[model samples]
Target: EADDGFIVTSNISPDSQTSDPITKAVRETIIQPQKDNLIEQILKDLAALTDRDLAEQKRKEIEEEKEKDKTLSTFFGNPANREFIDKALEKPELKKKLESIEIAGYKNVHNTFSAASGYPGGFKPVQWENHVSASDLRATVVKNDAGDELCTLNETTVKTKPFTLAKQDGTQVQISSYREIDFPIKLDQADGSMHLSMVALKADGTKPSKDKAVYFTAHYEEGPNGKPQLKEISSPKPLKFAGTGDDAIAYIEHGGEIYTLAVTRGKYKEMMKEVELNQGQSVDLSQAEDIIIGQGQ
Candidate 1:
């Protein structure tokens, strides 16, 4: 006898349809849901679980690609490194910096005539008579065979020159420009065999939905014995994101460093404008990013 008006009966008989002990006991038990319904529900749950698993896998794949692009190895591999070497003009001070520096090498040494870093609306110089004139300078670099270290001897000569700051009505408002070049380097870690192993991480002020933004690519290398060199192997690819306007946030990753070059999709032009700025003002750029000694190692 059971408490809930359910009775438990153990009816064992010798002629019980050849039932084994396990099957005989199971036959008397009652489940809350019918077996058919339970099976169907279980199958449906399993299908949903599989779909979720697939979705997660796809999301993970996308994340991996983004990470790869953010890492430094996608573009700085062996061939591209060699291309930078064979094509670079080897500026005079660049090789000198490499041979003297410890654990770091010269990245790029170049002359520019288009960048200025003075107070707003002020006259500087037309050419650095003491060092090199901005108009007479071309970019160049000297690195170890592995291309991992960098140095910039003279700082002010490499700064980007400012361009016209015009409003929609063509009224001058604010002048600006960028004067940095990208010189990719590889690390000599345990995985040093990897080549073309650099990426640029970009960053902006606010979220991308709020404003238009800038993108970036390597422009040139200063030379020592030959003509200036441009990174000709890879096409200038712009970093794209959602939206249009100012006050938005965005960025690019290179060699594991995050950099934001412009406000709205103007990497190449902005860089060139910096060149013009330095040239026009004859400003010193010895402290520019690409040429800064002992910085990029």
Candidate 2:
């Protein structure tokens, strides 16, 4: 009877007018889950922002503390403070204590020699034919335990001599060298060890060399009455070797000892075998398997 006209109808009862059961089920099962996910994402974003803000604030606080300490240090480094300290030390007990403090002495500190090139590939043997002067280096003193700066090595007081080595081409050349630089500043170490920090700079004094840093440790031996006496001040030896491919030969200097090792690519990890040589030793390596050296017991 209604085919000639369009018609829309709704149920008059409240129960029939309510949302369709199927539509309500779709909202609860799908759309509600999506809404929950959106809320979780928003919360995560807010937490990340808050954490970043807190970290920035903490960094600022640390910077402020460092500035304050620097200012205090400048104030204490004044000569007025030094005069006051000297006057205070005039007390008998204080003077006695200061004078009784046992300090370590220094023996001959040798200048260490190494190639000024990178690792991965070794020096071409020709690169070692360079000269180094004392003015081309800077030295610093640092506590071995805490790595704190104690003093700087005064170049004016440093007496240096050239360290020469013979080249493969029957010529003598100087390596990057350093000698005993005098420490004019008195170092006060109650119960800590100290070491020398050395860095080689170019002649222009505007840049640092690509070479690795070398360090000298103060060596001590027992004296006549159980007191530690200054022994040989040994320099660290850092050496490297060269090759073309993944298989290479490396010369390593560690713990005041020289060592050569065979490096080869393996299935899982690189294989390393120690090739030993006696003191002042040399080897001719035509093949990797020919590496045979004495092993220290």
Candidate 3:
């Protein structure tokens, strides 16, 4: 008999009972255990994925550390600099300082003189002397045969000498002065190569004569008995004139036309008297005469 208002019929078939079964035994034995196993597998897969993600992150951190160590090789590769780098790294406070060190490229070495007084073309080289002054000089680093920076020369420790210049009129009158000069930076190599672009100034704070303002490159070597020697690497080229005194460009107006002249620092005052030219006129000095006073022509 059914609970819902239906009477059981005597025609119930035995074949229907045999064809299917919805028993609690089947639910507990097969379906429930399969569902539990599926859940366990899903949890294991999630754990494995999380572990892989963590390992990948650790690998990236290791690679980043290697990059930081690579930069230390540049300065420390040479045995000379290695000792310094190692000593600096030993201190815990200095470990961070190594990160700030940088490798520099070749730089141009140039200089200028000031507050000088004398004649324009009377300077001559005297016996080399070691004189220290307020001025400083710098030069590019010279490399050894192994391509390592052997030594560097700066104006503070480099040597110097006095110079004397005779009058251009074939007279015995000469001016005695010291030229602000730099040359023959000694290196460790028995035969070492070097180059220079030197600018020499007269005692009057002006560029020297064409032959005096020389720019050349040379090689230095240890001579017999380990004495320093020098050989010119190339022909000496004259340094182009950089004007004299207070370098300035001037504009001159004449006959309704503007004339331009490139004059030295204070020479514009003299040109104002020689040529009736306005001080502020717009003119070109490309073709005008370069008027330099007290500068060796």
Candidate 4:
């Protein structure tokens, strides 16, 4: 019996007249059912084939089968790994977290992520063990079927400049950086229906700004003139509390000028107070939320 990377049964007699020497040699092994000659055949075949590309392809396929998605039953056939999973699932909390897990379906998959430094003032690209270029990070992205990744509203992490957060309890949670991620889009994959998860509020138990949320589409969306628009997050869930911060400041610097929204409780007062304290010149906030605080040369 011979099994040299491919299934060459002992029954197929090697043709002496064959042009491919390697194929013939691979097939020419002793046709005997009395003993397993797997090792010798593999050794000879390995010696005969030198090109790693096709072998690499075969390698991928062989490994791919082993890497397919598995159910607990099939997987528990590692029984222990599944057993560990089963034990954890016993808790209601784990079940809640499990159901909350979900997918985002982006139309353009070829565009995904770009690695950046893990922390501020640092620069290192994030990636899988066998890394691919950041320009096309979704190299192995799961095909976004209207199910696993096809949700119109997908929850993802959003980052922002440093901000002071005021929680419900009133203690300002100073976040160096934050990401807004959500829970499962909760729905039926068969109908390919989609649902909304909790809006961007936290990551790893940490809160994103009460006001600022970033889009994950800095990912999939692209072009010479399309991408990275600064916009508030939209969702199907209730947003009674989002973007409602009174102390949240709004300021933008463009073309060498700084402009601040003149909200009584926001950036206007925030900056005007500085003027009052420093320059001894300040106007009443007008009980208003808009006046121009600009620094245009």
What's the C-alpha lDDT at position 199 in model 1?
A: 19
Query: Best by TM-score, which number?
Result: 3
Writing each residue's lDDT as its tens digit, candidate 2 over 126-213 gives 1111224744444433323244433334332112332232222334333222222342222333232222222222212122222222
Give the distance in Å from residue 288's predicted Cα in candidate 3 to where it truly belongs: 39
lDDT of 3 by residue, 150-191 (tens): 344332221232222222122221112212223333444434
Q: Residue pairs in steric clash, candidate 4?
A: 76-79, 100-184, 104-149, 105-149, 158-180
Instruction: For residues 202-248, write the lDDT of model 4, one tens digit per residue.
Output: 32224233123211211111112322111111111101111334443
The TM-scores, one per candidate, come to 0.18, 0.20, 0.22, 0.19
Q: How does candidate 4 score on lDDT?
A: 0.24
Name the candidate that leads on lDDT.
3
Clashing pairs in 3: 122-165, 123-165, 124-164, 137-155, 246-265
User: How high is the CA lDDT of each candidate model?
Assistant: 0.24, 0.26, 0.26, 0.24
- The reply for model 4, stretches above 4 Å from the true place, is 1-160, 180-191, 196-297
Error of 3 at 43 (Å): 99
Better of 1 and 2 by TM-score: 2
The ten-residue window of minimal lDDT in model 3 covers 1-10
